[PDB]
Amino acid sequence: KTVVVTTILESPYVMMKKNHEMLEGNERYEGYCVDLAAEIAKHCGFKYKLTIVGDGKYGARDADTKIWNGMVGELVYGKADIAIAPLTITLVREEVIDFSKPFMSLGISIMIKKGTPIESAEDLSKQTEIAYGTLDSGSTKEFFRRSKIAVFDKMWTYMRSAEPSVFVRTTAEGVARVRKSKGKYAYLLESTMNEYIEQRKPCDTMKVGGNLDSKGYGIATPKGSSLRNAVNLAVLKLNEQGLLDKLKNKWWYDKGECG
Amino acid sequence: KTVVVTTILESPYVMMKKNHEMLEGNERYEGYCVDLAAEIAKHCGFKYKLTIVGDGKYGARDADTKIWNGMVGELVYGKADIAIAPLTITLVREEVIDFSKPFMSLGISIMIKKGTPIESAEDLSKQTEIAYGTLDSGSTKEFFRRSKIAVFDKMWTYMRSAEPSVFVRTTAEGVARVRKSKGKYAYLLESTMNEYIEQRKPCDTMKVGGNLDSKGYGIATPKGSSLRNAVNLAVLKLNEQGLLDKLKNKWWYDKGECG
Ligand SMILES: O=c1[nH]c2cc(C(F)(F)F)c(N3CCOCC3)cc2n(CP(=O)(O)O)c1=O
Ligand SMILES: O=c1[nH]c2cc(C(F)(F)F)c(N3CCOCC3)cc2n(CP(=O)(O)O)c1=O
Ligand SMILES: CC(C)(C)c1ccc(C2=CC=CN3CCS(=O)(=O)N=C23)cc1
Ligand SMILES: [Zn+2]
Ligand SMILES: [Zn+2]
Ligand SMILES: [Zn+2]
Ligand SMILES: [Zn+2]
Ligand SMILES: [Zn+2]
16 A cells, blocks of 8 residues: 655755646655665555655653654554654654664764854854854753753853853744844754755854764654664665765755755 | 633744743743734733644645644634634635724735845746745745735746746744845745834845735634624724724834844
8 A cells, every 4th residue: 555654845855846836646746765765665565655744843741641652653653654854863762663773873063154363163162252052942942951061061051041042942033143233142953954955055154073962863763663674774775875865965966056 | 711822833923931941831922913802802801822723833724634724723613703814805704704804904915035126926926037926835936826916826837837946844943945045036925024024134035016915814713702893893992993904013113124
């Protein structure tokens, strides 16, 4: 039967094509995870329907209702058969679904406006001219809250107390604050998105320094899924064939706007 | 029985309190519609639980499955008893749920970066230096697509074909696009949100021109609800008591940042 694929509208993983209103089904979409889904489906021998997650979320368990939201919720409640998306591999998610081996690495990184005299996390931690922050309710904030590393502890102590708030509700808001004329703000976010935005007009931001942690994105299936093993082996095959590296280069660089 | 209220996290209608993690139940939330819900419940004599709509949407019928999403779907399918939110009164919605009389007026409006030489839709339509657009899916786009008014037809013809795309996925994206544009992008959106953002730091956007249409937000109940009549009379009583105007002033202006 037709496999229901849950995914999320996040660039460049899944984007609406030019002329999407004239198109139907899977042809409406393009991007890294659209290309990845087509290859996974070929290698595993299934036909599929791409669906955009109903709530636009990745997946977390509400502490009060005990209900999972996002793509993880769609898998655990039987709304979708597989999630093919930049879904971070985490312990609480692996307790309720199965992840493939990762298809992409990422880590916390620093975004500056070009010109800002900052090249690293240590640089941020040792000055006060440039403000810095992150999403108000996510994994980057939690990384800093829990860290026992001196540099990151110093950064957290600053961020938690800073006035006005250095936290933002969205990346659109965070990047707008980086870009504001004489804004003197740096934004902490996933390296993959920082690198992506660095390749988009107006070409005024950059990723600086090394990543602060190491994580991976994986494909997720529900417990006991007949697809688990084949999907896992397919991710490894695509890596060994060089296809994952080719797709990253395609969507970040070949289609990049900053030279 | 405890009435289940569906609502949506949209500022300043319903927002998480700063200290929401320390709070429980209805006390976690604040905003115009939180104040409205408390007064409607008092007038109608019910106890209630505020819930945030699972999919984060207002309500539309999928053209293929024919299934309603959002708060409208929660009412239609029996998941909530009442929706107390900035839910626009429309024909297709009124066919499937009942709306109260409106509690607030709105219409499509133009957001500019301060200093942009635009005072009206006609001004936008007669030039090309300043790009303009709206949400990629929604009622504003549909208004333009369907209009027979010469100015609005001219605007639609431009927007539908503009490259790069003038459409955005979210208002956070639209507002950020206005803010970095040096005035070369204007964003079309509901007047109530445009007015709200004009009162938020960094105080660099303005609402300009008259509204392009006239609509209202209403409280919605499923067909056959025993609450319909009382909710409707309550909305009228609150208006006659001055409370609706008092709440709009409280949440838009008393709590504004640009005065
Ligand atoms: O599984 C997850 N995958 C995620 C993938 C991405 C992206 F980079 F776009 F791929 C992001 N971006 C963060 C930067 O702004 C744009 C959204 C967030 C993700 N989150 C929430 P977080 O871990 O709180 O950041 C997850 O949970
Ligand atoms: O019932 C509806 N009520 C809505 C109320 C609001 C708000 F202004 F926040 F109150 C908005 N905003 C549009 C501007 O960006 C933020 C969200 C959208 C609404 N939509 C979707 P639309 O009609 O496609 O715009 C509805 O359907
Ligand atoms: C008193 C308040 C609450 C300010 C109000 C809000 C909206 C309207 C309204 C005007 C014209 C057309 N329509 C379309 C049907 S509507 O959405 O029910 N309302 C209107 C009138 C008064
Ligand atoms: Zn067709
Ligand atoms: Zn909850
Ligand atoms: Zn919070
Ligand atoms: Zn009253
Ligand atoms: Zn589009």
